[PDB]
Design a binder for this molecule. Structure first.
Ligand SMILES: CCCCCCCCCCCCC/C=C/[C@@H](O)[C@H](N)CO
Ligand SMILES: CCCCCCCCCCCCC/C=C/[C@@H](O)[C@H](N)CO
Ligand SMILES: *C(=O)CCCCCCCCCCCCC
Ligand SMILES: *C(=O)CCCCCCCCCCCCC
Lengths: 62, 116, 279, 266, 4, 266, 62, 279, 135, 4
């Protein structure tokens, strides 16, 4: 049940993919730590919530 | 119904989802969920109070935010008996959960205590 | 997959199938669903009964005893240099009432022990950290007459030696019943008076009690010799049933408990007043 | 074997259910179950509203009492339901409305009572007036709402030719309209004969010479309940037992929305 | 185990 | 078609048959029909006696009368049958005994009487005592035999602390044991509601935490009959009708034979 | 001897079957924790303990 | 791979594509990049937004309560032998303001408890190490009336028994909301006054409040009996949202909080003075 | 000074709506409190700065450019359905970002009309009608 | 190990 993932390495020693290991010890998922491997999204629903979305090179009002 | 076999009657039992005036007359009660019970050989009648709620779970304490509504019962015609028959009788009521019912967040009950 | 059943969509009815009428005289509950008496929509149900399984209903440590034990100079009077508690869940009420929703049960038992101490006298110096011995004495084994007599050698009885300030002690015990399930209720006697008995005392026994010593006792002492200042401690015992099976449901206790049987005495009026037609 | 009987029925519409254990089967008038307007019979072109469960549910009217001197009761539809929940609101907010109905009449008594009620559902039930002036009953008097009206044993002509009452004067053996009551059996009907049954159930399709019409101006059906055999009990001279009428709109659709109609009744 |  | 009904039953055990024409189906407690100890659940090693038809037959106890002020009756099993023919003899000659039971409670009245009896079969029916002393009801008082006991409306504490009665004081709305009577429906039960049925039939498996036990020391089941709705008739104030209880041992087996037990009851 | 089971996840991070691992360390089963993976059953033995169980649409007394 | 987009090289323009002009009336933000209005070089971008994900913005224990509880001789006056705190993030301001960048949220909650104690009196002897009980009382369960009444038996409520000097206690709680997300803002009432109400009190409720008891309370006590000297303790509670999802962004609070609603009262002047043409 | 004290009838003006103010005028008749909102405009009536209201769905009617704003609103709530009588899901706020001006007249006025259409309406839990007490 |  060990999950092995890659670390995003910042400073490098003068010594490659370094991995880390996680095992969940509890049945309830609320006990789990955060994996912090989080995806993102498009801001459009806030920055461009327009019915006809127009291209930035074209006039906004036609 | 625990009257004699010679007694007849029709009864309206109703459920009003919350938010309006609690029914005071049959006229208001019949606008909500209801069953009209005809007394006869099948002695008993079941009204189901459907889950109709805004929140996904209600509180077991009393709270207006999660209030559940009102049950009322009115005569639809009246109890009628012939002569030589008791004119009054008891009705008994029973309650149980349907198969879609659940509870969560275990807590101590207020129904038992212990003094020092 | 543990969700409750989905609500089926249903429409109008005009028929000879009448699910709303029944006869409770038969002893059965009418298994109706809302779609038997009203028009329903389809609902994909995701709720589950995960938290009301028998295991989750009992999966809590509940306090069942507070044992007081002192560490002071052995005087000639009655002291509490060791204490004995007859093992039971009936000295407190909260776990007793949950177990008594059922007639019989079978489970393993986890005991966790929380120990707290305090000084009683303003000052006669201090005390060094105390170690506590909790010895289980099964029915028949010798019970201690003083806090350091030979029974505390514990060669066969199990003991816990707990150090003050350490994490609460904890042990598990198997299903140790003499029968195939524990009886929460026993409608009977341990003896029967016979016509040929010499006197009435011979066949007399308490109603609904079974064995005399039941599960035995826990004997608790402070192992340290006394300091000049007296130190009082309390051991609180928490029981949690685990790997639980239960049989034959019962109405829950509705009026205050009055002893280890089902007897009642006061506050026999659990229901409050409410008008027949008042919401 | 498991036990289904044409005497025991459950009717469920919307959030309301009716049970009866002493029915005498049920009538579907003219053999036609209610239905919506089909595209090839459609006439107003706007999209209709179909409130469905909000209006097609059982509404119980005020109970009336049947005594030894009762001559009968009548209601018109949709009028008896004009103030019933969202059925009344949709009726008054729309120029046009169409609806079929399930009518359930309830009257229980005992095995020692006797009497028989005739329950008749009449398309276009025109009733006769109270005076020498023809076709003069006023709108407010022709439309009693859930209160309904009554029959009389004889023609009592309104004589206050000064302040005429402008009411109907329905004589019972003439079915309130100049025909003999005995022939009312050509209309969809049931009898509640107290030794046999305690209810009558009649399903009514929408009937009119048009696919949809004004519900405010025109009543499609009349319900007439008359004692075919008078109430009697033991040897008492003043027995009374309730009669309750519960009616549910069916396949309701409305066209022509605008501001609400507010008729002048008083 | 499960590397990701 | 040929006519079988869940209202008409015949029960035959040994040389005894019961008929009823107004039953309300029958209950098999916890869905378990009685059975003998299986080898893999066996505990005493001696060969058991199984008297079969000599003990598994219907025994009728003395009738009790239900009047308007009756609060209820209770019996314990096997105690109510301790003096019944060869069932009682086998019970007292053997250290160990096991039995299931068919209980048939009989109460007929008429179509003009009304009332409802709740008949509950309770595993380990511990009852509460009459005094400040806990668990003090004596063996002879806890075991009334076929006579059974009664319920009361209130706790009457025995005060003769000198010559204590050592009796139970079962208060009816508390089911004689500190719980509310309304929840007794979680136990196997039927209701004899006089407008509907005139009998209750309940089949009881042996229930205990052991495969076999001492029948003399321990009662496995209690039968509690309480008026859920009181008896009433015409307008008379002192109607009384009989209640008769007939019980049959089922799958009886006994182990540990020796000389007979003779309890001291008086 | 590691047992690996799935957790029933409640709140989800903006990151699937999350598993947890269990090993029993003691010989006596009384020492074990509770697995809380508990099955349920039918209430019929209490709600309908009738010799002839009838269908809810049919009359209870025939 | 989580880096932000590379800058593209772009050169001069003379055309009818005009990305610099727009109309903000439409409700949209102009998605320009520097290469739309200036000549840019190619840049391989390696920066990422790893630390401003919703999980990383909330991944800190924030103090939400300081509960004070004493251990001293039970006198007849008002004492703090046990304390109760209604669970909330609105008694402090810092975590409240970060959560209120959003209208709705769904998360599990980690609670860490830091406990500190001190003597108050110059000297009446000392004290032995204290054990603390933190019991969660959900809406509806009985609340303690004294520090050792029966509610502390905790048979079903969860309790933590913490030993002084041990590592801070810590537990996690699932998403326990009654709705599908927690509402940080509720524009409504729990009751509505109706025309047929007997008086105006019946339908009156607080604006923007939902349930009365919300999540219940934490009841804290020292389990030890008192020493001769008094010992005062404080329990500091740190909440960390984990496995966080949030919906519908809001302007952040700009003037001081005034209660659990959105009300304001003073310091309604958040911006300082700066000349229109002063850098 | 009393928190969360606006009454139901005052929080719900119906089609009349309410207005914003330039400053916090505290109700002082602590005897017969008005129990009204006091929405200050640059604080968006709720303690945040009006300039950040642009994170909410919005349009601007700038008179040189357009004469209308059209915004389609989904149902937003933490529940799939709720009590409409107890809870308002959306608020519409219209504020002059730049004040009205005309020619050189000092008392120009022009109408603002708001037209709103329900969309995908569904209702559950029928019974007798709610009649709130507004007056 | 044994996944379930
Ligand atoms: C070093 C400490 C060891 C502690 C050992 C304790 C052994 C006893 C465990 C008993 C659990 C008791 C549960 C209750 C059973 C009762 O209901 C019934 N009277 C049994 O028929
Ligand atoms: C032994 C200690 C157990 C502690 C148990 C705490 C249970 C309650 C956790 C609540 C987390 C609350 C987060 C805030 C939610 C609120 O925004 C909203 N009012 C809910 O609609
Ligand atoms: C996946 O889990 C495969 C096996 C991993 C082996 C190492 C386990 C370390 C101990 C976990 C114990 C959890 C609590 C009983
Ligand atoms: C199954 O158990 C396969 C091997 C699991 C390896 C990890 C073991 C961790 C240590 C367990 C020690 C138990 C007490 C000696």
């Amino acid at each position: 049940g060990a999950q092995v993932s890659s670390q995003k390495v910042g400073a490098h020693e003068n010594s490659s993919t370094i991995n880390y290991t996680t095992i969940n010890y509890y049945k309830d998922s609320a006990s789990n730590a955060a994996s912090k491997q989080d995806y993102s999204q498009d801001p459009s629903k806030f920055t461009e919530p327009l019915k006809d979305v127009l291209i930035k090179t074209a006039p906004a009002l036609n | 119904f625990c009257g004699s076999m010679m007694a007849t009657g029709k009864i309206l039992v109703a459920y009003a989802p919350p938010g309006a005036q609690p029914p005071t007359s049959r006229k208001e009660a019949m606008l909500g969920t209801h069953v009209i019970w005809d007394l006869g050989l099948q002695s008993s009648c079941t009204m189901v109070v459907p889950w109709i709620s805004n929140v996904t779970y209600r509180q077991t304490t009393q709270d207006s935010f999660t209030e559940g509504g009102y049950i009322s019962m009115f005569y639809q015609t009246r109890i009628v008996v012939p002569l030589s028959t008791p004119k009054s009788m008891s009705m008994l009521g029973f309650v149980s959960a349907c198969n879609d019912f659940s509870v969560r967040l275990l807590r101590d009950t207020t129904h038992i205590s212990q003094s020092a | 997959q543990d969700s409750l059943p989905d609500t089926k969509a249903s429409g109008p009815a005009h028929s000879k199938e009448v699910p709303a009428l029944t006869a409770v005289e038969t002893g059965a509950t009418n298994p109706l669903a809302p779609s038997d008496t009203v028009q329903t929509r389809h609902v994909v149900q995701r709720r589950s009964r995960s938290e009301s399984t028998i295991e989750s209903f009992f999966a809590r440590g509940a306090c069942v005893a507070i044992i007081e034990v002192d560490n002071e100079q052995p005087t000639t009077r009655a002291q509490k240099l060791f204490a004995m508690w007859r093992i039971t869940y009936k000295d407190t009420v909260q776990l007793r009432r949950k177990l008594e929703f059922f007639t019989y049960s079978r489970f393993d038992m986890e005991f966790t022990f929380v120990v707290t101490a305090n000084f009683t006298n303003a000052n006669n110096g201090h005390a060094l950290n105390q170690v506590y011995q909790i010895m289980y004495i099964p029915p028949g084994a010798p019970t201690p007459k003083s806090w350091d007599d030979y029974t505390w050698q514990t060669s066969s009885n199990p003991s816990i030696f707990y150090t003050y300030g350490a994490a609460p002690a904890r042990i598990s015990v198997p299903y140790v019943g003499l029968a195939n399930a524990y009886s929460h209720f026993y409608d009977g006697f341990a003896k029967v008076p016979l016509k040929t008995d010499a006197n009435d005392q011979i066949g007399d026994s308490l109603y609904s009690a079974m064995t005399v010593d039941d599960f035995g006792v826990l004997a608790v002492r402070v192992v340290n010799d006394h300091n000049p200042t007296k130190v009082t401690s309390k051991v609180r015992i928490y029981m949690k049933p685990k790997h639980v099976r239960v049989w034959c449901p019962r109405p829950p206790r509705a009026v205050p408990y009055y002893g280890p049987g089902v007897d009642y005495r006061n506050n026999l009026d659990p229901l409050s007043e409410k008008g027949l037609t008042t919401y | 074997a498991c036990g289904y009987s044409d005497r025991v029925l459950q009717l469920t519409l919307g959030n309301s259910t009716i049970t009866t254990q002493e029915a005498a089967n049920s009538v579907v008038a003219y053999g036609r179950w209610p239905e919506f307007i089909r595209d090839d019979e459609a006439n107003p072109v706007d999209q209709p509203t179909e409130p469905d469960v909000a209006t097609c549910r059982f509404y119980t009217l005020d109970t009336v009492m049947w005594g030894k001197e009762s001559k009968g009761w009548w209601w018109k539809l949709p009028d008896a339901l004009r103030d019933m929940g969202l059925f009344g609101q949709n009726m008054y907010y729309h120029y046009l409305g169409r609806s079929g109905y399930t009518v359930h009449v309830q009257c229980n008594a005992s095995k020692f009572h006797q009497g028989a009620l005739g329950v008749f559902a009449i398309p276009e039930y025109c009733l006769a007036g109270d005076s020498d002036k023809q076709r003069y009953t006023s709108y407010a008097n022709a439309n009693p709402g859930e209160r309904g009206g009554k029959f009389y044993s004889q023609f009592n002509k309104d004589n206050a030719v000064t302040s005429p009452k402008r009411e109907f004067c329905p004589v019972d053996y003439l079915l309130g309209c100049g025909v003999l009551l005995g022939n009312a059996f050509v209309y969809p009907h049931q009898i509640i004969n107290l030794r046999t049954n305690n209810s009558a159930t009649i399903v009514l399709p929408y009937v009119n010479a048009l696919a949809i019409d004004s519900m405010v101006k025109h009543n499609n059906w009349g319900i007439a309940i008359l004692p075919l055999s008078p109430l009697d009990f033991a040897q008492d001279s003043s027995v009374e037992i309730p009669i309750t009428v519960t009616i549910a709109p069916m396949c309701s659709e409305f066209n022509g929305l605008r501001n609400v109609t507010a008729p002048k009744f008083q | 185990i499960s590397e990701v």
